[PDB]
Every structure is written in structure tokens, then in C-alpha cells.
Coordinates of C-alpha atoms and ligand atoms in Angstrom, one line a residue:
Chain I
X1 CA -17.1 -4.5 -0.2
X2 CA -15.6 -1.0 -1.6
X3 CA -16.9 2.2 -2.5
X4 CA -17.6 2.7 -6.5
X5 CA -14.4 3.4 -8.5
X6 CA -15.0 6.2 -9.7
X7 CA -16.4 7.6 -6.2
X8 CA -12.9 6.3 -4.4
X9 CA -11.3 8.7 -7.3
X10 CA -13.4 11.0 -7.0
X11 CA -12.7 11.4 -3.4
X12 CA -8.5 10.5 -3.9
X13 CA -9.0 13.9 -6.5
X14 CA -11.3 16.5 -3.4
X15 CA -8.2 14.1 -0.7
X16 CA -5.7 16.2 -3.1
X17 CA -7.3 19.5 -3.4
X18 CA -7.7 19.5 0.3
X19 CA -4.2 19.1 1.0
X20 CA -3.4 21.9 -2.0
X21 CA -5.8 24.4 -0.1
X22 CA -3.3 24.4 3.1
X23 CA -6.1 24.8 5.4
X24 CA -7.6 23.2 8.2
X25 CA -11.2 22.5 7.9
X26 CA -10.5 21.9 4.0
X27 CA -8.0 19.4 4.0
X28 CA -9.8 17.2 6.6
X29 CA -13.1 17.9 5.7
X30 CA -12.2 14.7 3.7
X31 CA -11.2 12.5 6.3
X32 CA -13.8 10.4 7.8
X33 CA -14.4 11.4 11.8
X34 CA -12.1 7.8 12.9
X35 CA -9.2 8.9 10.3
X36 CA -6.3 7.8 11.6
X37 CA -2.8 8.8 10.4
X38 CA 0.6 6.9 11.2
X39 CA 4.1 7.9 10.0
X40 CA 5.6 5.5 9.0
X41 CA 8.4 3.8 8.7
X42 CA 7.0 1.7 11.6
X43 CA 11.1 1.2 13.3
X44 CA 10.3 5.2 14.1
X45 CA 7.8 4.5 16.6
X46 CA 5.4 7.5 15.8
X47 CA 2.2 7.0 17.6
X48 CA -0.9 7.5 15.5
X49 CA -2.5 10.5 15.5
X50 CA -6.1 10.9 15.4
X51 CA -8.1 13.0 13.5
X52 CA -8.6 15.6 17.0
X53 CA -4.0 14.5 17.1
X54 CA -3.9 15.5 13.6
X55 CA -6.6 19.3 14.2
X56 CA -4.2 20.3 17.3
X57 CA -0.8 19.9 14.9
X58 CA -2.3 21.6 10.9
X59 CA -3.3 24.9 12.1
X60 CA 0.1 26.4 13.7
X61 CA 1.9 23.9 10.9
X62 CA -0.8 25.4 8.4
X63 CA 0.0 28.8 9.7
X64 CA 4.0 28.3 10.1
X65 CA 4.5 27.6 6.1
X66 CA 3.4 30.4 3.4
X67 CA 3.5 29.5 -0.4
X68 CA 2.2 26.0 0.8
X69 CA 2.7 24.0 -3.0
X70 CA 1.5 20.2 -3.8
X71 CA 3.4 18.8 -6.5
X72 CA 1.4 15.3 -7.1
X73 CA 4.6 13.0 -8.6
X74 CA 2.9 9.6 -8.9
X75 CA -1.3 8.2 -7.6
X76 CA -1.9 4.7 -7.8
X77 CA -5.3 3.8 -7.2
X78 CA -6.3 -0.3 -6.3
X79 CA -10.7 0.9 -6.7
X80 CA -11.2 -3.2 -5.4
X81 CA -9.2 -3.1 -2.7
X82 CA -10.7 0.4 -2.3
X83 CA -7.2 1.9 -1.0
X84 CA -4.7 4.2 -3.1
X85 CA -0.7 5.7 -2.7
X86 CA 0.1 8.7 -3.3
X87 CA 3.4 10.2 -3.8
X88 CA 3.9 14.1 -3.3
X89 CA 6.5 16.6 -3.1
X90 CA 5.7 20.0 -0.7
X91 CA 7.3 23.3 -0.7
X92 CA 6.8 26.3 1.5
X93 CA 8.8 29.0 2.7
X94 CA 9.6 29.5 6.9
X95 CA 10.8 32.4 9.0
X96 CA 13.9 30.1 9.4
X97 CA 14.6 29.1 5.6
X98 CA 12.9 27.0 2.1
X99 CA 10.7 23.6 4.2
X100 CA 11.0 20.8 1.6
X101 CA 10.0 17.0 2.2
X102 CA 8.2 13.7 -0.1
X103 CA 5.7 12.2 1.3
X104 CA 4.5 8.2 -0.1
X105 CA 0.7 8.3 1.5
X106 CA -1.2 5.6 1.6
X107 CA -5.0 5.7 1.9
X108 CA -7.8 3.7 2.2
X109 CA -11.5 5.0 1.6
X110 CA -14.2 4.6 3.9
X111 CA -17.4 2.2 2.6
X112 CA -19.3 5.3 1.1
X113 CA -16.2 5.9 -0.5
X114 CA -16.6 9.6 0.0
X115 CA -13.7 10.1 2.9
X116 CA -10.1 8.7 3.8
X117 CA -10.8 6.3 6.8
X118 CA -7.0 5.6 7.5
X119 CA -3.8 6.9 6.7
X120 CA 0.2 5.9 6.3
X121 CA 2.3 8.3 5.6
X122 CA 6.0 8.0 4.7
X123 CA 7.7 11.2 4.7
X124 CA 11.0 13.3 7.0
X125 CA 8.5 14.2 10.3
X126 CA 11.3 16.2 11.4
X127 CA 9.6 18.7 11.9
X128 CA 6.2 17.6 13.5
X129 CA 8.1 15.5 16.1
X130 CA 11.1 17.8 16.8
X131 CA 10.0 21.9 16.2
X132 CA 6.1 21.7 16.7
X133 CA 7.1 20.2 20.6
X134 CA 9.1 23.6 21.2
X135 CA 7.6 26.1 19.4
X136 CA 3.8 24.3 21.3
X137 CA 4.4 22.2 23.8
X138 CA 6.8 23.8 26.0
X139 CA 6.0 27.5 25.5
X140 CA 2.4 27.0 26.2
Chain H
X1 CA -2.6 0.6 -22.9
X2 CA -1.7 -1.6 -19.9
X3 CA -1.8 -5.7 -20.1
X4 CA -4.6 -7.6 -18.1
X5 CA -5.1 -7.4 -14.5
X6 CA -4.3 -10.9 -14.6
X7 CA -0.9 -11.1 -16.1
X8 CA 0.1 -8.1 -14.0
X9 CA -1.0 -9.4 -11.1
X10 CA 1.1 -12.2 -12.0
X11 CA 4.3 -10.2 -12.6
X12 CA 3.9 -8.3 -9.0
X13 CA 3.6 -12.1 -7.1
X14 CA 7.2 -12.4 -9.5
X15 CA 8.7 -9.6 -8.2
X16 CA 7.8 -10.1 -4.4
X17 CA 8.9 -13.9 -4.5
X18 CA 12.2 -13.2 -6.2
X19 CA 13.1 -9.9 -3.6
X20 CA 11.9 -12.7 -0.9
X21 CA 14.3 -15.4 -2.7
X22 CA 17.3 -13.3 -2.0
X23 CA 19.2 -14.4 -5.1
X24 CA 20.2 -11.4 -7.2
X25 CA 19.3 -13.6 -10.5
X26 CA 16.1 -14.6 -8.8
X27 CA 15.2 -11.0 -8.3
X28 CA 17.0 -9.0 -11.7
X29 CA 14.5 -12.8 -13.5
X30 CA 11.3 -9.7 -13.4
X31 CA 13.1 -6.7 -14.5
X32 CA 13.1 -5.1 -18.1
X33 CA 16.2 -4.7 -19.9
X34 CA 15.6 -1.2 -19.4
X35 CA 14.1 -1.0 -16.2
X36 CA 15.9 1.3 -13.5
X37 CA 15.8 1.7 -9.8
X38 CA 15.7 5.3 -8.8
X39 CA 16.2 6.2 -4.4
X40 CA 13.8 8.1 -2.6
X41 CA 13.5 11.2 -1.8
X42 CA 14.3 13.1 -4.7
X43 CA 15.7 15.0 -2.8
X44 CA 18.4 12.6 -1.3
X45 CA 20.0 12.3 -4.8
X46 CA 21.1 9.0 -5.3
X47 CA 22.1 8.5 -8.5
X48 CA 19.4 6.0 -10.2
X49 CA 20.5 2.2 -10.4
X50 CA 20.7 0.5 -13.9
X51 CA 20.2 -3.3 -14.1
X52 CA 23.8 -3.2 -14.7
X53 CA 24.6 -1.9 -11.7
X54 CA 22.3 -3.7 -9.7
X55 CA 24.0 -7.2 -11.3
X56 CA 27.0 -5.6 -10.2
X57 CA 25.8 -4.2 -6.5
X58 CA 23.0 -7.3 -5.5
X59 CA 25.9 -9.9 -4.9
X60 CA 27.9 -8.3 -1.9
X61 CA 24.6 -6.8 -0.2
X62 CA 23.2 -9.8 -0.2
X63 CA 25.4 -12.2 1.3
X64 CA 26.3 -9.3 3.7
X65 CA 22.3 -10.3 5.3
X66 CA 21.7 -13.5 6.4
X67 CA 18.2 -15.2 7.1
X68 CA 16.4 -12.5 4.8
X69 CA 13.0 -12.0 6.1
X70 CA 10.3 -10.1 3.7
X71 CA 7.3 -9.4 5.4
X72 CA 4.9 -7.9 3.3
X73 CA 2.2 -4.9 4.7
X74 CA 0.4 -3.7 2.2
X75 CA 0.0 -4.3 -1.7
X76 CA -1.8 -1.4 -3.6
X77 CA -2.3 -2.9 -7.3
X78 CA -3.8 -0.2 -9.9
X79 CA -4.5 -2.4 -13.0
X80 CA -5.2 0.2 -15.6
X81 CA -2.6 2.2 -14.9
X82 CA 0.0 -0.8 -14.9
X83 CA 1.6 0.9 -11.8
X84 CA 1.6 -1.0 -8.4
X85 CA 3.2 0.4 -5.0
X86 CA 4.4 -2.5 -2.0
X87 CA 5.1 -1.9 1.6
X88 CA 7.9 -4.4 2.5
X89 CA 9.2 -4.5 6.3
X90 CA 13.1 -6.7 5.7
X91 CA 14.9 -8.1 8.7
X92 CA 18.2 -9.9 8.3
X93 CA 21.0 -10.6 10.3
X94 CA 25.2 -9.0 10.2
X95 CA 27.9 -9.4 12.1
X96 CA 27.9 -5.7 12.8
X97 CA 24.2 -7.4 14.5
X98 CA 20.7 -8.2 13.5
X99 CA 19.2 -5.6 10.3
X100 CA 15.9 -3.9 9.3
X101 CA 14.9 -1.8 6.8
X102 CA 11.2 -0.3 5.5
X103 CA 10.4 0.4 1.9
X104 CA 7.6 1.8 -0.3
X105 CA 8.3 0.4 -3.5
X106 CA 6.5 2.1 -7.1
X107 CA 6.2 -0.3 -9.6
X108 CA 4.9 0.3 -13.5
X109 CA 4.9 -3.1 -15.6
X110 CA 5.8 -3.5 -19.0
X111 CA 2.9 -3.2 -21.7
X112 CA 3.3 -6.5 -22.0
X113 CA 2.8 -6.7 -18.7
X114 CA 5.0 -9.5 -17.9
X115 CA 8.2 -7.1 -16.1
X116 CA 8.5 -4.5 -13.8
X117 CA 10.0 -1.3 -16.1
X118 CA 11.1 1.1 -13.5
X119 CA 11.0 0.9 -10.2
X120 CA 11.4 4.1 -7.5
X121 CA 12.1 3.2 -3.7
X122 CA 11.5 5.1 -0.5
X123 CA 13.5 3.2 2.1
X124 CA 16.5 3.2 4.8
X125 CA 18.9 4.3 1.8
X126 CA 22.6 4.8 4.5
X127 CA 24.0 1.6 3.1
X128 CA 23.9 2.8 -0.9
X129 CA 24.5 6.8 0.1
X130 CA 27.3 6.4 2.5
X131 CA 28.9 3.2 3.1
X132 CA 29.3 1.9 -0.3
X133 CA 31.2 6.0 -1.5
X134 CA 32.9 5.6 1.6
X135 CA 34.4 1.8 0.3
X136 CA 35.3 3.6 -3.0
Ligands
LIG201 C1 20.5 -6.4 -1.7 O1 19.1 -5.7 -1.6 C2 18.2 -5.4 -2.8 O2 18.2 -6.8 -2.7 C3 17.3 -5.0 -2.5 C4 15.8 -5.5 -2.7 O3 16.0 -6.5 -3.5 C5 14.9 -4.4 -2.8 C6 13.9 -4.4 -3.6 C7 15.0 -3.0 -2.5 C8 16.3 -2.8 -1.8 O4 16.0 -1.3 -1.5 C9 16.9 -3.6 -1.9 C10 18.4 -2.9 -1.5 O5 19.3 -2.3 -2.6 C11 19.2 -2.8 -0.4 C12 18.1 -3.4 1.4 O6 17.0 -4.6 0.3 C13 18.8 -3.8 2.1 C14 19.6 -2.4 3.1 C15 20.2 -1.7 1.3 C16 19.6 -1.7 0.5 O7 20.9 -1.8 -0.8

């Protein structure tokens, strides 16, 4: 069975606050140790990211985006299924100009309800898929 | 104050059936009179579609895509808020070959709970954003 609705809702709130706080350890504190992220659409074939993969990504990214803002546009919470969706808009400044993105992010809670266990995320993945490998993989 | 969960759930199911049926009348049966569709992300600036816009548009669009199949990957229903999200994968055939799309569809039910009153949809919008304008 899913966790109590009230706990799931609190975890959804904390997940958003950890995202808004724009620190690696603050945001990932709300991910379970086994949590995965999957970029949507499936047709893009972007490989699943483990928690470890996201731990390598988020430091250099979050550093590159200054004045990060997170605006929550829609939250849909299905407590009987232990699932939720957020629609969010993000903005930041970068050395190359302003950054904007929007995210339809599907969440599943763990059984206790105090972590997110699975993430599927429809968003513009160009920075992750195209930019980071250049300034990260090849340079190092 | 939203309708009972089972009333909303019946409308959600009807909405999905009307989509899967791939007919304009069947799909629009579950729209409220004032229901609008809005393409996401907002940054794309794709204009809202009214119910009337959709009545005009969907006959030609569904005629272009044959053998339409709808795969429901995820449904998230928030009965206390009268909201739901569907993630769906669509497949069809066209003369230019096979067709695929994927949709994160956000739904709001009307207060009575028997219709969808608002839709915001993140999907690959190239047909409505590139094709139709060029066509006109
Ligand atoms: C005729 O299309 C619909 O019935 C339709 C639809 O029912 C839903 C629920 C979402 C859509 O985005 C569309 C659509 O407009 C569409 C499509 O499904 C495929 C390609 C281009 C499109 O514009």
C-alpha cells in the first residue's frame, strides 16, 4: 500500500523546496538511495539516470546557472497510487545568456512516503545531453 | 468544491476512450462548452485552441493519421483538486510513413465532474506549429 496521503504531500513539498534551494545535497536528500530519473519522451532514447549519475551532473550544472528560480505552475497528487506530477518553470542566468526550461515531472513515492523513488521528466534536455558532455566529458 | 472521485474517474475514462476512438465528435463529447487546449511549454507560444478550433481542426488531422493506437503509460488522478494527468504514447500511419508522439496531458474537470474544462498538453507540436501555419 502507499504511504499516508499527508506524508506523501509533505514529501512533495520538501522535494519542491530542495529543488528551489538549488544545492546538490539539499535536493538529492529527497531522493531515495535507489531513485532513478528518466528523460521523456521515451522516443528520445535518453538513458535512465541513476542517483549516482545525477550526483555527478548537478554540481557543475547548478554552479553554471546563477540566480536560479523555480515556479510551480501545477501540482497533481494521486495519494491512492503514491504518485504525483509537477509542472514547473525554471530560469537562471548563465555566461552564455538566460536559461529557461519547463518540466512535466512525474513522481513516485517510496513506501514510507518520505522520499521520491522514481522520476520521469518531460523537459528540454539539450543542456544535459549536448552541453554538459562538451564542457565536462571531453575537457576533463 | 470538486465532484466525487468516482464521478471524476468516469469522466477521465470517457476522455481516454474518446481519444482512443479517434473521431472528432467522440473526442469532443467530453469537453465542456468553454474547454480550451493549451500546448506546453508556454515558451513555445502556441496559441490556445478553443472547442470550436478543435471541431474545425480534428477532422482533417485524424483523417491524415490512420491505424491510430493510444498507449496509456501513466494516469495520475487528484480527486481533491479535480485534476488529472495522463502520459500517453500515440502511434499512427501516414503516407509519409509511421507516426509517433507522446503527450503529458494535464486535465481539469468541471465542477459537476462530468466534463473536462481545461487541458494543458506537453507534446511534440510540430504539426500544429510548423505544418498548419505554413499551409495557410
Ligand atoms: C487529432 O489530434 C488529436 O485528436 C489530439 C488529441 O486527441 C489529443 C488528446 C492530443 C493531441 O495533441 C491531439 C493532436 O492535436 C495531435 C496528435 O494527436 C498528433 C499529432 C498532432 C496533433 O495535433
